[PDB]
Structures are given as C-alpha cells and as structure tokens.
Amino acid sequence: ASKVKQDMPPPGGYGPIDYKRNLPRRGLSGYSMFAVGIGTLLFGYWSMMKWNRERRRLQIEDFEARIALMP
Amino acid sequence: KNFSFRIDELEEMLTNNRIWRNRTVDIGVVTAEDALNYGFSGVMLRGSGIQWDL
C-alpha cells in the first residue's frame, strides 16, 4: 500500500552553497588618503592663520584702550 | 548556506588585524622534523608544511 517515506533530498538536489572567502576591497588609494589628509591640514592652517591675525588685531585694540585709560 | 558570511565576519575581525598578527605571527614555530618526532598530528603537522590528512 504505502511506499517508502524517509528524510531525503528534494529531486534535483539543493541549491549551491557559498564557501569561498569573501573579504571585499572597499576602495581608496594610499595616494588619495594622503592627499585628503594634506588638504584638510592645509585648509585648517589657512583658517587658523586668518583667525589668529584677527585675534592679534583685537588684542592690539584692547591694549590701546588700556593705554588710553592708564594716566 | 549562511555560515560562510559568519566565517567572513570572523576573518574581517581577526585575519588582517595588526594586533592579532603581532600576537600570533612567528609564535610557537615548530619544524616539520620536530613535529613528526614529537608525535604531533593534524593542524600541528599541516602548519609546518607537512601534507598529511587521514
């Protein structure tokens, strides 16, 4: 009557199973990274140059006010 | 069918890390002749270049 029925793989087998190592290379050259670092360093240097010169002028103004008040 | 990604995450955390390499590279070096004479087997043999697998 009934036929054999036990745990068997489905007809045609199973799908493929990935096993190879997969560590992708995200992507940015060493030259590009160094260039980005140098560029941000230069931008910061320029901004700090401008701000420090302005601070020097402000300090001179404060010193002039004090000198006017001294006598 | 999903275990390879877990192995990949393991390798991402450990394989190319410089601290892991400095912890494990050139540590416990054993020669093939010493491995054979001392009775080693498995990975302890195959890490020295011996081609043996039961």
Side-chain angles (χ1 to χ4, degrees), chain B residues 19-31:
Chain B
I19 310 173
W20 179 253
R21 291 180 58 93
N22 283 112
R23 286 313 287 278
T24 51
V25 162
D26 272 299
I27 307 297
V29 181
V30 62
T31 67

Side-chain angles (χ1 to χ4, degrees), chain A residues 17-67:
Chain A
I17 289 167
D18 303 291
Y19 66 89
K20 301 280 185 64
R21 167 203 277 177
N22 179 26
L23 272 72
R25 186 268 187 189
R26 298 298 272 272
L28 203 70
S29 184
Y31 294 134
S32 299
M33 292 167 166
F34 281 127
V36 170
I38 301 299
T40 187
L41 278 180
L42 292 184
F43 168 73
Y45 291 169
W46 191 78
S47 196
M48 284 300 315
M49 184 209 274
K50 300 289 94 176
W51 181 223
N52 272 346
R53 278 169 192 169
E54 182 65 26
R55 288 167 81 198
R56 292 310 286 250
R57 285 187 292 273
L58 294 165
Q59 192 204 36
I60 278 172
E61 200 189 350
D62 297 347
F63 285 5
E64 281 170 0
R66 174 210 169 210
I67 283 170

Side-chain angles (χ1 to χ4, degrees), chain B residues 5-23:
Chain B
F5 271 23
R6 313 281 93 81
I7 311 181
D8 285 327
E9 294 167 4
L10 183 63
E11 284 206 274
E12 286 273 25
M13 294 298 299
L14 284 195
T15 290
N16 285 313
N17 192 293
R18 88 183 54 194
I19 310 173
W20 179 253
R21 291 180 58 93
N22 283 112
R23 286 313 287 278

